[PDB]
Amino acid sequence: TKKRRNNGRAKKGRGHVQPIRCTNCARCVPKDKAIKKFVIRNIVEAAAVRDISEASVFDAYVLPKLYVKLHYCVSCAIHSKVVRNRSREARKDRTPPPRFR
Amino acid sequence: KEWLPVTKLGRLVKDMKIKSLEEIYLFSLPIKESEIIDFFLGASLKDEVLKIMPVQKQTRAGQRTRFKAFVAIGDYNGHVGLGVKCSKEVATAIRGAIILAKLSIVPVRRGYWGNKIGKPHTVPCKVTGRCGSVLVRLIPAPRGTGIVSAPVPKKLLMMAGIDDCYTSARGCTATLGNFAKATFDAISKTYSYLTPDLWKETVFTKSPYQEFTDHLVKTHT
Amino acid sequence: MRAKWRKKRMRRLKRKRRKMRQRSK
Amino acid sequence: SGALDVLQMKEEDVLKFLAAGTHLGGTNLDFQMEQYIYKRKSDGIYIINLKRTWEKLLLAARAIVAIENPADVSVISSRNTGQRAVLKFAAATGATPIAGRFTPGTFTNQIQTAFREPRLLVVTDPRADHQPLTEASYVNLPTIALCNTDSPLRYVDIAIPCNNKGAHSVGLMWWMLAREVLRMRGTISREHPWEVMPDLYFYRDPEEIEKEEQAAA
Amino acid sequence: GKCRGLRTARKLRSHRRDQKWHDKQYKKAHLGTALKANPFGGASHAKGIVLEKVGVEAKQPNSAIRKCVRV
Amino acid sequence: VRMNVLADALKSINNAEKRGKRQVLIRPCSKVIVRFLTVMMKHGYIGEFEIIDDHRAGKIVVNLTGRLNKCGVISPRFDVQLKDLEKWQNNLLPSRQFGFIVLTTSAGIMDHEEARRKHTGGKILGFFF
Amino acid sequence: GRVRTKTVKKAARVIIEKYYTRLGNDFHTNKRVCEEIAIIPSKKLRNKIAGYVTHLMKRIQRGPVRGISIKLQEEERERRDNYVPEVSALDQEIIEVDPDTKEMLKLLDFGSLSNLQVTQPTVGMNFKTPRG
Amino acid sequence: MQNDAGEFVDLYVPRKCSASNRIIGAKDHASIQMNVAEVDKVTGRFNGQFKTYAICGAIRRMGESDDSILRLAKADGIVSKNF
RNA sequence: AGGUCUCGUAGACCGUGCACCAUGAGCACGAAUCCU
RNA sequence: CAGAUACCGUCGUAGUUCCGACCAUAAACGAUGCCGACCGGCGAUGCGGCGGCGUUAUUCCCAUGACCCGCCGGGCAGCUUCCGGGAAACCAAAGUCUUUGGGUUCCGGGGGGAGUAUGGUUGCAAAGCUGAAACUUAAAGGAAUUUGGCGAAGGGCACCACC
Ligand SMILES: [Zn+2]
């Protein structure tokens, strides 16, 4: 039978949306269906940041970040442990998971 | 074989100040002790079973069967009930089904066909009761017709005391439990249908709990 | 068997039948 | 309920309503309680009427005094903000108190030791105590509620428009309800100030208990 | 019934005729193929001539061989 | 588009009765509805009813009493006679003790009993019990 | 893994409900008490009862526990909920009143009360939190 | 319930709701006959006159019974008419 | 003139895939009510 | 890989692009036809209009663009519900239904044979539309509970498992 109120997407009064390409594989996926993520990453982690900070021309120099936006289909997101399955009752929750740290 | 009631209603019936349970249906109180109806309805109340069906559940090892028995209870000049209970052994299943039937009996009213002479014989109106997929219709019949039905709602209708019904059914009536439940729902809703015979405002008698709460507080703590 | 490939094989047999019917009028 | 020229508020009940902060309601509203609210003011707070609260106080007091057995009124609070108010109300009226952890088998399970079947039921809120209303639906039990402008009205009979977030307004309304019931019973006179203090009903957190113990004797 | 009009009968009779053609027993009762594929041709009994004897077997759940003839 | 007026009028009455409303607001005010509620009012099922008059099809406000089960409309305007009225009474009514068949005729608009007594037939309008 | 069961904990709760005065922090003293006030089939489970009632003595000396109700620690609750001070905290000499509240009191039963003062309302009616 | 003779064939007459005017059945457990007290006209204490009001389970489950009790009290003369 | 600003320190969300993995002959199972 | 004309990798012909001439098929799916009326709300959103404290285009005024609080009508939709419907999943429509009748159009009678052969028709072609029968079978299906088994995921345990 029908699993969800929508169909794993957000297309309601459109009928057609443009497709995009996935990032892990090259599978063609519609834009509104793909599990997208936008991570704010760093150039260096918390190990080399002291090495850059002590051995720099300028003191207290702010390091640039890495803004990349990833687009995943269902199989690539599940197989790379991005989204996980839930219960039937626990599926009805559009809130993101909490960020304690 | 003494009676030790735990509710207010059972003790107050045991004190021999309830003349009939018609006022208990009038106040729509839950009949919670099964031996109150056994105290009221005695030799006029007899029973017969309907069907015992197999119900099985799988486990790691083998099949766990459990017997579910359908029985009905009711005097032939009024009230009628139905009860379902499922257990391992057959005798305790039948005993629990008879008990759960005696918890839930309802009174029915009987009407006329054309002329109002003597005692009534048939259902007053086309009263309909539906549960699951089964749809049961009870249409009044002229005097001396007899119950025309499938055999088990026919026996339920004579055990309810109604002499004449014109009946009809649709859907899968082979499930005898759901069919009997639909017949019980049809004969239960013969009270909740407003007719012009009763439109005046009923006088409000005092509550039996309100009438004998002094007796209750002088008997128990 | 899904319906697509059995529709395809009926299509090829229909084509072969039409060719043989045209060559055997 | 307010039809006589004796049973109204004289001068001081409105003063205690304004002192306890009973006049302000929640941000949200109920369409069942749109006639119990005066209007809406700025900052999204509803100003609540006091005559309507008085008329439900009369009606709740009448329904309580109407029966002649004081042990068949049951008063229930699950939140900590009114546990002592229920206890003092049952001490002053003879009622049956339930404070905290209402077990789900009191009104319907006949084999338990705590099998109760009262005649009237008063509860502090329909929001948090959505459990005793459904169990009091299965047996013919009425329901009296000290309900807020945001709390839903389901399975209730008298809905007193109240302020059930602060301890102050709730303790004052249990005190005035006990006062009015004891006036209808006749043990307490209708005109003499019988006030022991209304501070016998007021609840506070244990940090303020320690603070007041160290500040006072 | 869907169409409810005081003077709508032609549509109802046409729909009833088409939907009555869309049946199985009425197809078997109102076609020449059903009355011509009948080996007896609308007869309860028929005579015959025995040619030889054929022994056919039963189905898979119950195993036996039955005795038949060609007539 | 609004085609028949008695059908959705009694449908609104049936909806407001089984919900539990006290008053209902019928948006048109045609004479057939007025005659039907005068028949139903003289039978003593529904209470007083107002009517609002303006320069269009005005509104109708009915004070409803707890004496009504269902108001139904038989559509289209079927033909009925005196010799075949008992079949309609048998298959359309829950009992032979009450319930009326309102029908239009040359003698006006009334129930089936007055039409039987005055010996006339006509077209069907609806039913209520 | 030293985890106690319901038998030793329930029996300990019962004897600390019934016998609270003749106890103490000494393990051997309440071991002899558990020998006296209760019959025991064993000795290992006796030592478990004595150790756990010593633990319950350390828990009672720190604070209340919601499993038992000892009468010596009881009725100081009623002492804390039974005192009456000199001010009820609602007989104040001044009460702050809103202009909408002032208008609602104007139609209520009176025209002016001599224990109230009117406050200026806020200048901007922004009250809802930013959610989206 | 009557006939040509005069006896009532229905064994009892069930109560009707004071708000929606529906038949209270045997198994409508949410039906409540709420009993309120009437006060004296001078002294203002309990006298003994009783005003029994009734309600059905459907409007109680929908949650609009308090307005019905208030309107019944206003019609009876319990709640003051200014309100 | 004083010369370590205050309060506790999840201070680990470094990664994206992972070798090849087919098949199982049937015979072998039955559904119930209460005292003398 | 046992076999690989397959998953994988490097090239790669038609194609993918535009003009001009054609076929008219999709899980063309909200798997839910169109018009109209009625029956619980709540919080946001897009358009246009209405009203009202305060802030801004720097301090006075006017209406404007940008905020705040509310309404009205249309539209895409969201959350709860013993109104109600259903076999259930679910549905504010899939409700107003044995208490069956608002108006109108198309479409289906067990499962295969089968969208198959033939007849007709359009098209350069591929094909599109209309559309059977003989025969065979007692099942084929829909919803959901309970153990089962996963080269599914999460907590763990075990020297008859590993390190
Ligand atoms: Zn991919």
Swiss-Prot record, chain C:
Transmembrane parts of this sequence: none
Domain of life: Eukaryota
SUBUNIT field: Component of the small ribosomal subunit.
GO MF: structural constituent of ribosome
The family this protein is said to belong to: Belongs to the eukaryotic ribosomal protein eS32 family.
UniProt subcellular location: Cytoplasm
GO biological process, any: translation
Originating species: Oryctolagus cuniculus
A Pfam family that the UniProt record links to this protein: Ribosomal_L41
Name of the protein in its database record: Small ribosomal subunit protein eS32
Record keyword RNA-binding present: no
Gene Ontology cellular-component terms listed: cytoplasm; ribonucleoprotein complex; ribosome
Keywords: Cytoplasm, Ribonucleoprotein, Ribosomal protein
Segments for region (Disordered): 1-25
Function according to Swiss-Prot or TrEMBL: Component of the small ribosomal subunit. The ribosome is a large ribonucleoprotein complex responsible for the synthesis of proteins in the cell. Interacts with the beta subunit of protein kinase CKII and stimulates phosphorylation of DNA topoisomerase II alpha by CKII.
Swiss-Prot record, chain E:
Disulfide bridge positions per record: none
Cross-linked sites for Glycyl lysine isopeptide (Lys-Gly) (interchain with G-Cter in SUMO2): 36
Modified sites of kind 3-hydroxyproline: 61
Residue ranges of the region described as Disordered: 1-25
Post-translational modification: Hydroxylation at Pro-61 affects translation termination efficiency.
Biased composition (Basic residues): 1-19
Subcellular location: Cytoplasm, Cytosol; Cytoplasm; Rough endoplasmic reticulum; Nucleus, Nucleolus
Location of N6-succinyllysine modifications: 53
Function: Component of the ribosome, a large ribonucleoprotein complex responsible for the synthesis of proteins in the cell. The small ribosomal subunit (SSU) binds messenger RNAs (mRNAs) and translates the encoded message by selecting cognate aminoacyl-transfer RNA (tRNA) molecules. The large subunit (LSU) contains the ribosomal catalytic site termed the peptidyl transferase center (PTC), which catalyzes the formation of peptide bonds, thereby polymerizing the amino acids delivered by tRNAs into a polypeptide chain.
Assembly and interaction partners: Component of the 40S small ribosomal subunit. Part of the small subunit (SSU) processome, composed of more than 70 proteins and the RNA chaperone small nucleolar RNA (snoRNA) U3.
Family, similarity comment: Belongs to the universal ribosomal protein uS12 family.
Protein name, UniProt field: Small ribosomal subunit protein uS12
Organism, scientific name: Oryctolagus cuniculus (Rabbit)
Gene giving rise to this polypeptide: RPS23
UniProtKB/Swiss-Prot annotation, chain F:
Gene Ontology molecular functions: structural constituent of ribosome
Alphabetical keyword list: Cytoplasm, Nucleus, Ribonucleoprotein, Ribosomal protein
GO biological process terms, semicolon-separated: translation
Subcellular location: Cytoplasm; Nucleus, Nucleolus
Transmembrane segments: none
Modified residues (N6-succinyllysine): 87
Primary localization class, coarse: cytoplasm
Assigned GO CC terms: cytosolic ribosome; nucleolus; ribonucleoprotein complex
Subunit record text: Component of the 40S ribosomal subunit. Part of the small subunit (SSU) processome, composed of more than 70 proteins and the RNA chaperone small nucleolar RNA (snoRNA) U3.
Protein role: Component of the small ribosomal subunit. Part of the small subunit (SSU) processome, first precursor of the small eukaryotic ribosomal subunit. During the assembly of the SSU processome in the nucleolus, many ribosome biogenesis factors, an RNA chaperone and ribosomal proteins associate with the nascent pre-rRNA and work in concert to generate RNA folding, modifications, rearrangements and cleavage as well as targeted degradation of pre-ribosomal RNA by the RNA exosome. Required for proper erythropoiesis.
Xref: PANTHER family: 40S RIBOSOMAL PROTEIN S15A
Entry's family note: Belongs to the universal ribosomal protein uS8 family.
Protein name (record): Small ribosomal subunit protein uS8
Native source organism of the sequence: Oryctolagus cuniculus
UniProtKB/Swiss-Prot annotation, chain G:
Subunit record text: Component of the small ribosomal subunit. Part of the small subunit (SSU) processome, composed of more than 70 proteins and the RNA chaperone small nucleolar RNA (snoRNA) U3.
Family note: Belongs to the eukaryotic ribosomal protein eS17 family.
GO-annotated molecular function: structural constituent of ribosome
Residues bearing PTM N6-succinyllysine: 18
InterPro entries, sorted: Ribosomal_eS17 (IPR001210), Ribosomal_eS17_CS (IPR018273), Ribosomal_eS17_sf (IPR036401)
Purpose: Component of the small ribosomal subunit. The ribosome is a large ribonucleoprotein complex responsible for the synthesis of proteins in the cell. Part of the small subunit (SSU) processome, first precursor of the small eukaryotic ribosomal subunit. During the assembly of the SSU processome in the nucleolus, many ribosome biogenesis factors, an RNA chaperone and ribosomal proteins associate with the nascent pre-rRNA and work in concert to generate RNA folding, modifications, rearrangements and cleavage as well as targeted degradation of pre-ribosomal RNA by the RNA exosome.
GO cellular component, one term: cytosolic ribosome
Cross-link (Glycyl lysine isopeptide (Lys-Gly) (interchain with G-Cter in SUMO2)): 102
Major site of localization recorded for this protein: cytoplasm
GO-annotated biological processes: translation
Keywords in alphabetical order: Cytoplasm, Isopeptide bond, Nucleus, Phosphoprotein, Ribonucleoprotein, Ribosomal protein, Ubl conjugation
Gene3D superfamilies assigned to the protein according to its UniProt record, in alphabetical order: Ribosomal protein S17e-like (1.10.60.20)
UniProt subcellular location: Cytoplasm; Nucleus, Nucleolus
Description of post-translational modifications: Ubiquitinated at Lys-102 by RNF14 and RNF25 in response to ribosome collisions (ribosome stalling).
